[PDB]
Design a protein around this ligand. Structure first.
Ligand SMILES: CC1(C)Cn2nc(-c3ccc(F)cn3)c(-c3ccnc4[nH]ncc34)c2CO1
Length: 290
């Protein structure tokens, strides 16, 4: 048991700096997700993440916190249960998302990243595994999770942007990291959106060119810097190359034009003649016997 109304269960995976568990609400009977961090770690970070989660509450696509406290030898946070990550669905769709599905996700993922920025934070871990779909009536709503690597980019009181600086502690997934990260440059808002661009091309292509190579981080960096966007996005609509170029060229402290980025794909969504039924690839899978 955990807290007051939550029972513990399976270990379902590992988040950034912690372990994730299935939980069952005793009062309402609903299922929940629980994060546990051992107390005696010399670098405790669960409480920091929880406060960020609390700051994000009320926004679209932010998981609702049910409880957060201490039990036994663990700090504990309780989230509403959500659906599979975009990586899970990507594998279920044979690692191939249709252009319509990619654009549908892109619109929401940009707004999730914008909302976090609107709360003075940068995610710094933008990857498919950190986007989870909702459940039930929210089955078409993309959530954003795992604020363990998040970091304030402007002062809450004055909005003063953090200074341009060297940050060589490579933090985040290498495959989707911004080139600025590889060059040991402090991440800013442009870096979250640049990482998202690599995610979108990941969905389009099925694998990024710098896949399957401390040593590997340098190799990924070299291939990322040796890959022109024209080569990376060859065969796909120009908006993806336009999106990446806009994020890469964005100034360090500049506020991104989120609306322009979303409209890039929305206009392409309309021009391609796609229905807005909000039907994803995984809603079209067929099933049967073995
Ligand atoms: C394992 C990982 C790579 C990382 N991770 N971490 C969490 C998590 C859970 C509780 C919490 F308090 C903080 N994080 C979940 C998570 C899983 C299921 N339903 C959820 N709802 N909200 C979050 C969430 C996942 C999923 O993907």
């Amino acid at each position: 048991r955990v807290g007051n109304r939550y029972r513990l269960g399976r270990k379902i995976g590992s988040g950034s700096f912690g372990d994730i568990y299935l939980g069952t609400d005793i009062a309402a009977g609903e299922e929940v997700a629980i994060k546990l961090e051992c107390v005696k770690t010399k670098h405790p970070q669960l409480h920091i993440e929880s406060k960020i989660y609390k700051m994000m509450q009320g926004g679209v696509g932010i998981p609702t916190i049910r409880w957060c406290g201490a039990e036994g030898d663990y700090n504990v946070m309780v989230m509403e249960l959500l659906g599979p990550s975009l990586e899970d669905l990507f594998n279920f769709c044979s690692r191939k998302f249709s252009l319509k599905t990619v654009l549908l996700l892109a619109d929401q993922m940009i707004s999730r990243i914008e909302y976090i920025h609107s709360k003075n934070f940068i995610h710094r871990d933008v990857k498919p595994d950190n986007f989870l779909m909702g459940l039930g009536k929210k089955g078409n709503l993309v959530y954003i999770i795992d604020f363990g690597l998040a970091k304030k980019y402007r002062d809450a009181r004055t909005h003063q942007h953090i200074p341009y600086r060297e940050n060589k502690n490579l933090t985040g997934t290498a495959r989707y990291a911004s080139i600025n990260t590889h060059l040991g440059i402090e991440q800013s808002r442009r870096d979250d959106l640049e990482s998202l661009g690599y995610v979108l091309m990941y969905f389009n292509l099925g694998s990024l060119p710098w896949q399957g190579l401390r040593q590997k981080y340098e190799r990924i960096s070299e291939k990322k810097m040796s890959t022109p966007i024209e080569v990376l996005c060859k065969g796909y609509p120009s908006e993806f190359a336009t999106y990446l170029n806009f994020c890469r060229s964005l100034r360090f402290d500049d506020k991104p034009d989120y609306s322009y980025l979303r409209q890039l794909f929305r206009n392409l969504f309309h021009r391609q003649g796609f229905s807005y039924d909000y039907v994803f690839d995984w809603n079209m899978l067929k099933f049967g016997a073995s």
